[PDB]
Amino acid sequence: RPTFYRQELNKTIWEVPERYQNLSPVGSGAYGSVCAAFDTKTGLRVAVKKLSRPFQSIIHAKRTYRELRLLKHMKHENVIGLLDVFTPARSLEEFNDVYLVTHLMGADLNNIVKCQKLTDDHVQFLIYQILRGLKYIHSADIIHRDLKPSNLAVNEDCELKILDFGLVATRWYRAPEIMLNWMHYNQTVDIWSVGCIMAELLTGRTLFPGTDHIDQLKLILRLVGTPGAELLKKISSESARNYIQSLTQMPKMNFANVFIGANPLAVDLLEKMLVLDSDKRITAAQALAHAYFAQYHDPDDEPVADPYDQSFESRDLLIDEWKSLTYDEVISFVPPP
Numbered sequence: 144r145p146t147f148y149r150q151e152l153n154k155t156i157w158e159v160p161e162r163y164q165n166l167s168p169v170g171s172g173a174y175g176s177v178c179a180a181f182d183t184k185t186g187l188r189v190a191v192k193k194l195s196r197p198f199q200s201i202i203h204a205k206r207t208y209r210e211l212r213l214l215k216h217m218k219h220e221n222v223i224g225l226l227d228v229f230t231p232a233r234s235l236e237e238f239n240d241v242y243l244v245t246h247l248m249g250a251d252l253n254n255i256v257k258c259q260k261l262t263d264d265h266v267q268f269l270i271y272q273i274l275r276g277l278k279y280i281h282s283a284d285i286i287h288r289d290l291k292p293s294n295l296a297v298n299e300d301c302e303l304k305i306l307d308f309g310l311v312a313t314r315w316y317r318a319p320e321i322m323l324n325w326m327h328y329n330q331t332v333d334i335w336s337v338g339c340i341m342a343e344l345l346t347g348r349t350l351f352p353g354t355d356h357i358d359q360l361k362l363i364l365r366l367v368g369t370p371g372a373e374l375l376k377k378i379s380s381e382s383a384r385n386y387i388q389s390l391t392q393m394p395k396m397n398f399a400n401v402f403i404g405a406n407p408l409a410v411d412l413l414e415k416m417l418v419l420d421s422d423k424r425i426t427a428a429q430a431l432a433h434a435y436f437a438q439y440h441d442p443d444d445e446p447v448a449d450p451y452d453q454s455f456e457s458r459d460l461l462i463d464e465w466k467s468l469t470y471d472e473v474i475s476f477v478p479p480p
């Protein structure tokens with residue numbers, strides 16, 4: 144066991160091994176707080192997240208296990224994984240805190256979109272990396288479900304990693320099949336979000352800035368047109384169909400016109416990503432082979448993930464059970480060294 148030291152930071156207490164130095168708060172970053180630190184072992188900067196109230200309820204306990212399992216499995220240059228996981232607890236009975244550590248990128252995608260609008264070459268590289276990460280995530284039977292600029296960490300080299308897979312409105316980037324309230328979507332839910340991100344990097348504005356779920360659907364349909372016969376026949380929900388079909392029929396707009404002087408290859412990719420019918424939407428793997436990425440695509444360097452056991456997802460267990468399981472995962476952790 145290494146030696147731990149203690150400090151208060153922004154009302155929050157931090158108990159970490161001495162090898163992590165110079166902790167500086169960087170945010171309240173979802174179900175926890177986050178510090179940038181210096182890892183004396185490697186000489187590299189890291190991000191340390193202290194989970195908030197990890198065993199507060201069955202919901203929190205399952206979430207904590209889910210995150211730790213997910214982060215332990217992700218081993219890909221475009222997805223965050225773990226350099227370290229630790230707890231100051233000496234035993235299971237004293238176990239109430241989890242700390243996770245990963246390479247510090249230092250910003251999200253949004254932290255660059257401000258005051259800037261990107262050239263084609265940078266859009267190609269950023270989206271290529273997103274898709275490269277999604278191919279890997281999707282190959283593990285994981286759907287991100289909340290891809291958005293704030294969930295993409297980006298360093299000064301413009302290298303990118305996807306955050307928070309598996310677990311600035313989310314609404315703005317979410318596929319229409321999940322706006323409508325359908326729980327039989329597929330992995331191309333995430334491809335829609337990529338399309339919204341790409342559009343925004345090219346134009347400099349949020350593609351679908353809706354003020355609620357209904358307005359969001361309305362903004363989406365103004366661009367992509369209202370459901371045709373084929374799609375309408377796949378919708379079970381009477382309320383969903385009745386609503387959609389109670390709207391004034393709207394045609395698909397010309398993407399070449401909406402995205403005027405963008406690379407026409409980018410416009411072609413965008414029209415294959417932002418298709419209403421998710422059965423017809425391009426996959427991450429297919430998108431990687433698209434002509435837009437000819438300068439980046441290498442099919443021998445776009446790997447897939449090892450088998451991911453998500454059987455825990457169907458299980459209804461007690462807090463002490465999720466807690467003990469999380470504990471075992473902390474103790475069995477093997478780093479990249």
Ligand SMILES: Cc1ccc(C(N)=O)cc1-c1nnc2ccc(CCc3ccc(F)cc3F)cn12
Nearest residue numbers: 169190191192243244245247248249250251296
């Ligand atoms: C996204 C972001 C935005 C701003 C800043 C910053 N101001 O330093 C940094 C980042 C930032 N740069 N790199 C990361 C890696 C992860 C996280 C999310 C929190 C997290 C998840 C898993 C872990 F193991 C450890 C963690 F800390 C935020 N990061």
